Amino acid sequence: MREIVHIQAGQCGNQIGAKFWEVISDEHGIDPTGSYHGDSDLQLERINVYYNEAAGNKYVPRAILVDLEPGTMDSVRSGPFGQIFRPDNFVFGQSGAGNNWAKGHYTEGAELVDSVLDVVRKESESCDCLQGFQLTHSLGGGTGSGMGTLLISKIREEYPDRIMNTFSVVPSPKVSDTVVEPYNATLSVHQLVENTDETYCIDNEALYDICFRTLKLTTPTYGDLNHLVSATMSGVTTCLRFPGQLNADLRKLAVNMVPFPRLHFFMPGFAPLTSRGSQQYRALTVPELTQQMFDAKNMMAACDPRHGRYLTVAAVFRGRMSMKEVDEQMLNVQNKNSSYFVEWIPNNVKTAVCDIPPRGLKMSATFIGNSTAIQELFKRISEQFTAMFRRKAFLHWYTGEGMDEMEFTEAESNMNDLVSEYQQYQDATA
Amino acid sequence: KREHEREVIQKAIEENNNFIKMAKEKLAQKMESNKENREAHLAAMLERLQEKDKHAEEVRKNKELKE
Ligand SMILES: CC[C@@H](C)[C@@H](NC(=O)[C@@H]1CCCCN1C)C(=O)N(C)[C@H](C[C@@H](OC(C)=O)c1nc(C(=O)N[C@@H](Cc2ccccc2)C[C@@H](C)C(=O)O)cs1)C(C)C
Numbered sequence: 001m002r003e004i005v006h007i008q009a010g011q012c013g014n015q016i017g018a019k020f021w022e023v024i025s026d027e028h029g030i031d032p033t034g035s036y037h038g039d040s041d042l043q044l045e046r047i048n049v050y051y052n053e054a055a056g057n058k059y060v061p062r063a064i065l066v067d068l069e070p071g072t073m074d075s076v077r078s079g080p081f082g083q084i085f086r087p088d089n090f091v092f093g094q095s096g097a098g099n100n101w102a103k104g105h106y107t108e109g110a111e112l113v114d115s116v117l118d119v120v121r122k123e124s125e126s127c128d129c130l131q132g133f134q135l136t137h138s139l140g141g142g143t144g145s146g147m148g149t150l151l152i153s154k155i156r157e158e159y160p161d162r163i164m165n166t167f168s169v170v171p172s173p174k175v176s177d178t179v180v181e182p183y184n185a186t187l188s189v190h191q192l193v194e195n196t197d198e199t200y201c202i203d204n205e206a207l208y209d210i211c212f213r214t215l216k217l218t219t220p221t222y223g224d225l226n227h228l229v230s231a232t233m234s235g236v237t238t239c240l241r242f243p244g245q246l247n248a249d250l251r252k253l254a255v256n257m258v259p260f261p262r263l264h265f266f267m268p269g270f271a272p273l274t275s276r277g278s279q280q281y282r283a284l285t286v287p288e289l290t291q292q293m294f295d296a297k298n299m300m301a302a303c304d305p306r307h308g309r310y311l312t313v314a315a316v317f318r319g320r321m322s323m324k325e326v327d328e329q330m331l332n333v334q335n336k337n338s339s340y341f342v343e344w345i346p347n348n349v350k351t352a353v354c355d356i357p358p359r360g361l362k363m364s365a366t367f368i369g370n371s372t373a374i375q376e377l378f379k380r381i382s383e384q385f386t387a388m389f390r391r392k393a394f395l396h397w398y399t400g401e402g403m404d405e406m407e408f409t410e411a412e413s414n415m416n417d418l419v420s421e422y423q424q425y426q427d428a429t430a
Numbered sequence: 431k432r433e434h435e436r437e438v439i440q441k442a443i444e445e446n447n448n449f450i451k452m453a454k455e456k457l458a459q460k461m462e463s464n465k466e467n468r469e470a471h472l473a474a475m476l477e478r479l480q481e482k483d484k485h486a487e488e489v490r491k492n493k494e495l496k497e
């Protein structure tokens with residue numbers, strides 16, 4: 001139908017992206033060759049949102065794979081689904097960005113970005129009605145972060161009236177010891193506040209605590225983290241990929257979720273939480289899904305929801321279940337907790353049910369919340385940023401690429417202003 | 431934004447070029463100044479020694495000037 005172009009950038013972006021393609025490919029009965037082999041037509045109705053149709057009855061993901069180094073792309077070419085991507089849609093350089101946003105945004109990323117844009121253009125042109133773009137990347141490295149945000153800025157220039165959507169992985173010192181990640185993240189957030197329409201915040205700190213505390217994994221790997229990411233991505237794009245009423249395209253989603261243009265950062269949530277392989281013998285009940293998906297322990301961003309207020313919430317239930325019961329359980333959650341929901345956006349929780357459950361589950365639920373408690377994540381990045389920046393530590397890696405300190409002070413300011421806008425709405429009354 | 435991106439890479443290039451230029455300059459002034467100092471220090475050592483030759487002809491002349 002209305003086509004979405006997908007771009008994945010950098011190691012993280014390409015790992016989570018690959019993983020998304022595997023998962024939704026299986027949800028739509030498309031196998032590694034591009035051949036459909038399923039038993040429903042719900043699978044094919046809105047396939048064109050994410051797949052182009054090749055002759056021979058083949059489906060090619062509408063996906064562009066970008067990095068400044070070859071590593072993760074030889075690795076994706078030879079993943080399970082690797083042979084599925086169009087080959088001139090792999091765009092890669094040779095030297096890598098060394099976890100430096102300035103290199104990604106200004107010097108090396110600069111070199112490669114016109115080649116990416118040509119592939120994007122080519123994919124656009126062959127779309128009947130393009131809805132827009134979605135990007136997977138982390139904010140704490142150099143390619144996903146600095147190049148990925150350079151891309152967004154260039155795509156916005158050529159396509160100023162399409163929706164831009166990202167899946168932005170937020171860094172945490174529980175997962176990474178690279179010291180400049182708060183610099184890259186703050187510079188990136190600055191770009192995201194200006195140039196995206198929706199951003200899903202996937203917080204490495206949240207994923208790690210989920211894995212450790214709840215899934216009881218003593219030594220989580222990235223693969224463990226990414227398993228939670230891909231469940232989530234599958235969940236949040238359900239409404240775009242199946243027939244339905246609510247949030248069925250990117251623009252309808254943004255009008256339901258974004259009351260003020262800057263506060264477009266979302267907390268996703270998910271139930272049930274599971275670890276790879278290990279087995280799901282008991283289906284959850286509609287009351288369990290409902291309590292779990294609003295649990296703080298099920299949020300992919302480490303924010304405490306009781307610390308803020310929901311401006312808007314979209315909830316998605318999957319698998320065959322009682323719509324009547326979904327309805328009572330949702331009403332029950334809002335009525336029993338009415339004060340976490342801003343009285344000045346009436347009826348701000350929307351609910352969808354899709355009949356097809358995700359692989360290996362009889363049922364799940366995905367939550368997407370625009371909560372003021374997301375300020376906590378920005379505050380954490382800001383505190384890490386300021387501790388270094390007030391002494392100008394590590395700056396020479398950035399100015400050696402031509403950046404000025406001013407650019408840093410601006411990013412910091414824009415982000416401090418974001419945090420206070422969320423605070424203003426947490427306290428607004430009616 | 432696109433004009434700014436251009437300035438930044440330009441500034442990078444400029445600062446790198448300037449680092450090289452200054453190093454070339456400082457290297458060449460140090461070399462020629464070291465060359466001069468070393469020449470002087472050897473010129474003076476040799477002329478001191480030349481003055482030993484003048485004085486030794488002067489001592490021998492003075493001898494044969496005694497009758
Ligand atoms: C030497 C110590 C690192 C291994 C380790 N520790 C740290 O980085 C430090 C140590 C001391 C200070 C605070 N912490 C943050 C770590 O566990 N890290 C970085 C992991 C990530 C790391 O973990 C391990 C145990 O290998 C990695 N995971 C993978 C991984 O998932 N690789 C998969 C492929 C892959 C996937 C994504 C990205 C790269 C590779 C392969 C398969 C088996 C899988 O799916 O699990 C590669 S490196 C978590 C914090 C997320």
Ligand SMILES: Nc1nc2c(ncn2[C@@H]2O[C@H](COP(=O)(O)OP(=O)(O)O)[C@@H](O)[C@H]2O)c(=O)[nH]1
Binds near residue numbers: 010015222
């Ligand atoms: N969840 C997750 N985080 C990742 C993955 N790979 C890297 N990261 C995190 O991403 C940040 C570094 O970004 P990365 O994508 O490797 O750099 P890039 O290739 O320059 O974009 C650090 O916070 C890493 O912990 C991944 O596969 N999954």
Ligand SMILES: [Mg+2]
Binds near residue numbers: 010011141
């Ligand atoms: Mg990398």
